[PDB]
Amino acid sequence: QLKPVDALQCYDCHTQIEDMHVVGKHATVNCVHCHDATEHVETASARRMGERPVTHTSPEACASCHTAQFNSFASVRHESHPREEKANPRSRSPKFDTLIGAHGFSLEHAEPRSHAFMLVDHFIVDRAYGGRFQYKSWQNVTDGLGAVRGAWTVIEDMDPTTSDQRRFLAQTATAANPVCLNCKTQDHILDWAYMGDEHDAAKWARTSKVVDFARDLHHPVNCYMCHDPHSTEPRVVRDALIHAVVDQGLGTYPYDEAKSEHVTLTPVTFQRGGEDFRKIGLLNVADSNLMCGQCHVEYNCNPGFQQSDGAPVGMDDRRTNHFFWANVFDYAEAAKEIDFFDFTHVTTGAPLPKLQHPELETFWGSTHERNGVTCADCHMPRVKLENGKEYTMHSPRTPRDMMNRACLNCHDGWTEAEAEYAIDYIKNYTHGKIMKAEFWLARMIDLFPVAKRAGVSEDVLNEVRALHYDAHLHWEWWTAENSVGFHNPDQARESLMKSITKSKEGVGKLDAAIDAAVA
Amino acid sequence: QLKPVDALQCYDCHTQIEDMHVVGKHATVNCVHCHDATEHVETASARRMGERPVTHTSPEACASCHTAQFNSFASVRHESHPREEKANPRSRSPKFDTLIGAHGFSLEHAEPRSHAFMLVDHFIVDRAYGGRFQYKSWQNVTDGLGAVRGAWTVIEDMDPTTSDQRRFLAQTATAANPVCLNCKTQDHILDWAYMGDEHDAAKWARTSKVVDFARDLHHPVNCYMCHDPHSTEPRVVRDALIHAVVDQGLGTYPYDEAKSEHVTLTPVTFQRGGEDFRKIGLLNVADSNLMCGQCHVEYNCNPGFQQSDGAPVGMDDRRTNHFFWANVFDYAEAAKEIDFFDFTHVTTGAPLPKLQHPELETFWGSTHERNGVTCADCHMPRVKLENGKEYTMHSPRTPRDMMNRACLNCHDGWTEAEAEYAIDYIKNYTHGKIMKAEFWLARMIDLFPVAKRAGVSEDVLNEVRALHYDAHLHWEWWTAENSVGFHNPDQARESLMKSITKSKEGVGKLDAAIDAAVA
Amino acid sequence: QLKPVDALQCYDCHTQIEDMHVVGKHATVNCVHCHDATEHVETASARRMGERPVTHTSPEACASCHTAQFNSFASVRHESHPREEKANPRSRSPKFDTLIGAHGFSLEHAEPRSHAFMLVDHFIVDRAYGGRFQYKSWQNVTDGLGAVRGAWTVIEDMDPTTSDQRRFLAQTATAANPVCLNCKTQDHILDWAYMGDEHDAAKWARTSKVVDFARDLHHPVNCYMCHDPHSTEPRVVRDALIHAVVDQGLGTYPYDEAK
């Protein structure tokens, strides 16, 4: 078993760690729990690392003293439908194949499931690695603890001998790139420079061969993503978040300057060979909006194209690791500020944004957010125990499972059935609007080939392409966002109605132009 | 009540029956349980039947001594959604109406329900008899025991005075023909020659007036379909199965020669007037894959057309009673070996196969099949009794109802929730691919009229018709097959990805040709 | 918070502990979790204790690293009928009043309930302290966690000004004595010589005024009754059990020599 190391001896070189360690709730916790540094200590200097110490990045490294949190972390909600495709009449976006066209998400876009699986599902989804990585067995799909212990215990590589991205199954894509992994794992936290910049000290960067990167990575949503392992203090580690909030001065709540004062990120930079290498953002309070917003946001983590000139924007460019940090109504402008779009629709020829789970930016300005509610209040409350220390659950999930804690504690005039009914009322209403936005956008899209083939002018096409951008944005936001309007029902409603209005305008212009063209 | 007959007196003429009867577990069971042969005995010769003895073909004939099995046989799973149409966003094939076009299945293709109803549902489905046969009352839909006792106790004929197939309701078809009945009933087992050939001794054949045939038939999935009534030994009786396995030497497991040695059918032929009339296939072991594969397979039981010359293939031809006996990847070649296709798609003009429930041929080569699992292991296990003789259940149904017996006995590291989750993971994943295969195939189909009307060449159309055959096959297999991928998830995945690839190729060729044509 | 102490400094005078500590699964666990020894360290020599260091005996001292086991330890089984008298047709011994006569158990012998309550129940049962100690409230009967955290947070002394064993209610007995406590708590583990012999180093002994001893005791069935806190290894601490196994020569399984 473990033998404690002489922390003082570490502290002589590791002065920032000493400052954080000696003062927090891990003061008595020895380095050997998370680091094997014997050869390091024998070989390091004040400036050279010497032999690289091992850092244990498994969530299980925390389990020896925080079993309750680890067990909850690893737990699996079976009722979260697994590997359920959204392009599906039983799911979020029945017309998705028309709307997203040749985009990578057309190869597969499943609904989310439990956190334990995030890195595995990233590796094995059909859009990510050409089908290179597969569960070793269909039995393994249930194994949340296994996944937490390491992806490669439950999945395997169809060709360990090659590192190129290619299709191993016909209907897959190779959309993954190294930026993705930042929202699946932070095993690479010491191997990745801030933003994924190429860096002397970084094994991995935005431009790495993702298949090689993938093989170096094991655990989902590491515990230290939200808790500093040295001081225990709440933090974020996600580079693009710290970039938005601190570097670009946008604030933790970019729409609330007073709240951004009350909730803060304090950057801490770590160097390698005396140059800035990595950063964390220490939270002044444990605001889970920011912890969860490391991932549950709209982002670029993919190549794209410039709005100005159509030029590709490849992984070398920092824009491929970017948090827009903007609500649905400000998003188009935020994408313009970085001169960026994701894809050209294969049918309409319209430059389009690709929207991914903007839960936090939807949550901003909602009644609940305005009243200081955070994600964890509804998705990751404390357990309730008649006779025990009530720790925080650590696998976030629908409040439906825990309504007394999630809703009924603040809404005590309501029964569980009532609080669910209120949920369903909003989701149903919103879902309805998403289906209509789909109907109209699909109708618009489907009219494009008719227009083109009828000889409708580029001028008209171009005007409908401009409409498509907003029609798309104000639709996809909502199939991307996983609350089906619950997080911000009035915003979902305005925005989806805007999508519809844009689409109907687009359809009207195409219909008129086709009509004139044919006559 | 019954008076036993002198079996010895029967045995003098019935030497094959004697051999089977005296040696098995029915040695003490008198003929009068299943036959009323008094006038027969008085009138028969060594060669002429004389007066025809009555054979009791009701499953209830077995109930006097096998109540437990009969009751289970007659039971109704209420949770199997009844008369649920597959061409339906809530079911298997939302785009089915586009994909199947004018095919008979477009009038109705409901999901399966409990075995007790199979003959009734065959009679009354909208595609079968033009709506001629109807439940006497909508109350009767629940009556599984009634159906087992005789179809005509719960259903009725809208016009007993005529025997022609015609529509009694506007949106029905008259797809039924006599071959169908072989997978619904074997009441006609002594009235139908092997293969349904016209025969002096057969009242009924492939070419009979199906409405007259229908009225002669009463009970579903007769007990003796899987058990020889004389010896009790496991068997099959379905002619096209015995044809594939024995006559054509394909083996019980055509993809496993060693397994086909270990599991065997021994033909037994019965003559009439000294010529071969009917056959059964005695199983050496009670392998329910073969018992269930009498019906849960892909087959021809319908007229079609020749691939070579488009000529009709009518009921007179043996190909209209055929088991393809091939997996999805070998099916196209197997249909070519018999120079056959089912229908021309009304929109595309493509010759197409029509696929029906290929559960067994999907099951072949699956992990479970490879490990010697059989259908009944998951769908028809033994009951579990703390204090009773544990007989086999006899109404097959989803293992979800009986997970401890179906899954958890072999998978003891799993909870019920886990084993269901693994099921759902595969069905969800597969369903997703079926929806995309539908999207693409429908898009291909819908483009055909645009191509044709734009003046695209027959050469291009013909090339997309060739793609349609495979696009169709690798789609319909999976909406036809009722496990939604569970029976062979890797095969479903490869095949559905092939369907998609073919469709996308088809769409690409039509788009290019239309574009060139218009310019 | 806690600031670790230099354990190597401790080892300089605590070889017996070092030998247990450095070898086991608590090698990395600092003494400060369970001891306050700052003044001890300032004043001690190898031959002189100096200031007595504090030893934290709360099961909650272990909950910062073993919350799951602690929470389970504190849990209450509501189905275990509480305060159910055995001399009772609904219980174990309907004729117990005749059978036991004037024995102290005649004043109350309830069925056992959850471990969390064992010290509390010992203090408040009618046969033990003459009704001296009582739940502060009948509401307190549910509070397993409060009981684990300290008996005196949920129960109270009817007369803190006197130490004598006497009846406070007419049908009570004063059967409690210091030996009882050994099966309720080991808070007194450093204050009680083996067997409860009078001893210069022992505050408490078999012959102590049980009411004063009661007041010094807080936690039920301490985590360290079964687990050595320094090595983590399984152990027993109960003197009479060691005495039976070792001193009486009976072995761990007196009816099975091989075992």
Ligand code: HEC
């Ligand atoms: C024992 C050797 C531990 C290891 C391994 C880990 N933690 Fe820990 N942690 C430990 C103690 C004794 C405490 C203090 C308990 C107390 O409340 O006094 C903690 C505290 C934390 C906290 C909470 C801080 C708070 O504000 O309440 C967190 C968030 C925490 N520890 C996180 C954590 C992580 C992520 C770990 C793996 C990297 C981890 N701990 C390991 C003891 C030990």
Ligand code: HEC
């Ligand atoms: C943080 C800003 C993320 C980045 C970078 C990537 N993903 Fe992601 N992903 C994120 C969240 C919050 C969720 C749950 C919400 C949702 O839309 O499902 C996901 C989900 C996935 C999943 C599972 C569901 C699915 O789409 O099938 C997969 C397979 C996945 N993400 C893959 C993936 C890829 C390939 C990425 C780089 C191109 C990528 N993710 C980046 C958060 C973030």
Ligand code: HEC
């Ligand atoms: C961000 C998505 C987190 C992940 C990753 C981990 N934890 Fe966490 N933890 C998180 C929150 C929002 C809270 C509540 C904070 C508050 O003040 O309300 C916690 C709390 C803890 C604690 C403190 C005791 C408790 O409330 O349970 C500990 C010891 C802790 N977390 C440990 C821990 C472990 C071991 C993790 C990996 C298994 C882990 N956390 C990840 C948010 C997040």
Ligand code: HEC
């Ligand atoms: C990046 C490391 C993330 C952090 C931080 C948070 N979430 Fe997450 N979440 C993430 C992904 C990639 C997924 C998809 C996982 C998959 O394999 O499909 C999810 C999923 C969820 C869900 C759905 C859970 C379910 O049962 O379906 C919820 C409700 C959720 N996430 C909420 C959530 C909360 C509240 C967070 C802060 C406490 C949080 N997540 C952080 C990625 C990441």
Ligand code: HEC
């Ligand atoms: C309470 C007012 C909530 C707040 C705070 C957050 N979410 Fe939420 N979320 C809530 C509901 C009622 C639902 C619908 C769930 C249902 O069972 O119908 C959701 C949904 C999600 C999901 C998808 C979960 C699922 O359907 O299984 C995710 C991934 C999610 N929410 C994330 C999330 C984030 C990241 C939050 C902070 C930005 C957040 N939620 C807050 C209710 C509430």
Ligand code: HEC
């Ligand atoms: C009583 C007069 C019976 C009639 C009518 C039927 N069966 Fe029978 N069966 C009967 C007996 C006494 C036995 C032997 C019981 C034993 O285990 O010794 C059987 C056996 C069977 C078997 C099982 C053979 C085996 O391998 O275990 C089967 C499959 C069977 N019987 C089928 C069956 C059918 C389909 C019937 C209606 C046609 C039928 N039995 C009627 C007694 C009687």
Ligand code: HEC
């Ligand atoms: C054995 C090779 C069969 C032949 C010949 C016929 N059917 Fe069938 N049928 C078979 C199975 C294994 C099933 C269940 C699987 C499924 O696809 O549902 C069925 C089902 C039916 C049903 C009920 C569901 C429905 O389609 O509405 C009907 C009404 C039905 N079959 C009718 C039918 C007709 C009209 C046939 C001759 C054209 C026919 N069946 C033949 C197995 C077999």
Ligand code: HEC
């Ligand atoms: C094929 C689809 C079958 C139908 C039709 C009938 N039975 Fe069956 N039966 C079948 C199997 C797969 C088994 C188990 C065989 C094995 O060795 O595991 C059975 C078993 C019986 C038995 C034996 C006792 C038992 O296991 O229950 C009997 C007596 C029996 N079956 C009778 C029976 C009756 C009365 C039927 C019509 C109501 C009937 N079987 C139909 C498969 C099939």
Ligand code: HEC
């Ligand atoms: C021809 C006589 C069949 C035999 C032999 C087997 N099956 Fe069957 N099955 C058949 C039909 C025509 C149907 C459709 C019935 C209807 O009226 O819709 C079915 C249905 C099933 C089902 C679905 C049951 C439900 O609850 O929905 C299952 C699971 C099934 N069949 C399995 C099965 C098994 C395991 C068999 C061998 C033991 C078997 N069937 C034989 C036709 C016939």
Ligand code: HEC
């Ligand atoms: C265990 C490994 C199975 C084997 C062996 C067989 N089937 Fe199956 N089947 C299985 C599952 C998990 C499902 C999905 C059912 C669910 O509830 O999700 C099915 C489905 C069917 C069905 C449709 C039943 C329904 O959804 O109600 C049929 C008609 C069917 N399976 C037939 C069947 C045949 C004929 C088998 C031998 C060739 C066979 N199954 C084996 C699991 C298993």
Ligand code: HEC
């Ligand atoms: C809680 C997990 C502990 C830690 C860490 C340390 N000690 Fe301990 N110690 C603990 C208890 C509960 C007791 C009471 C006796 C028992 O066996 O349970 C003790 C006792 C001591 C003693 C007295 C031993 C004796 O002579 O009777 C000493 C000298 C002692 N402990 C020293 C000590 C040192 C130096 C530690 C850091 C290495 C240390 N303890 C850690 C509980 C716990």
Ligand code: HEC
């Ligand atoms: C963190 C600062 C701890 C304190 C306070 C306590 N324990 Fe502990 N314990 C801790 C660790 C890091 C470990 C090793 C876990 C591992 O994965 O190896 C342990 C282990 C135990 C064990 C079991 C050892 C085994 O055989 O597996 C026991 C029985 C144990 N700890 C008991 C215990 C007690 C009774 C405590 C209060 C006096 C206590 N621990 C405090 C971390 C910490």
Ligand code: HEC
């Ligand atoms: C002395 C410190 C004890 C140790 C060591 C163990 N037990 Fe115990 N147990 C003890 C008491 C004084 C009581 C009565 C508590 C009360 O307040 O009434 C108990 C009770 C039990 C029970 C009953 C719990 C219930 O739900 O009623 C059981 C089942 C029990 N004890 C079992 C048990 C086991 C298995 C032990 C070793 C792990 C154990 N006890 C140790 C005193 C003490």
Ligand code: HEC
């Ligand atoms: C260990 C050898 C013990 C001695 C010394 C004492 N008690 Fe005890 N007690 C012990 C156990 C294992 C149990 C549970 C089994 C049972 O008979 O209940 C108990 C229980 C109690 C209780 C609760 C039930 C009851 O009698 O009301 C009380 C109130 C109690 N014990 C008091 C008590 C007294 C007064 C003691 C000294 C005279 C005493 N206990 C010693 C284990 C042991």
Ligand SMILES: O=S([O-])[O-]
């Ligand atoms: O692709 S991820 O952002 O769901």
Ligand SMILES: O=S([O-])[O-]
């Ligand atoms: O039509 S039958 O084969 O379902």
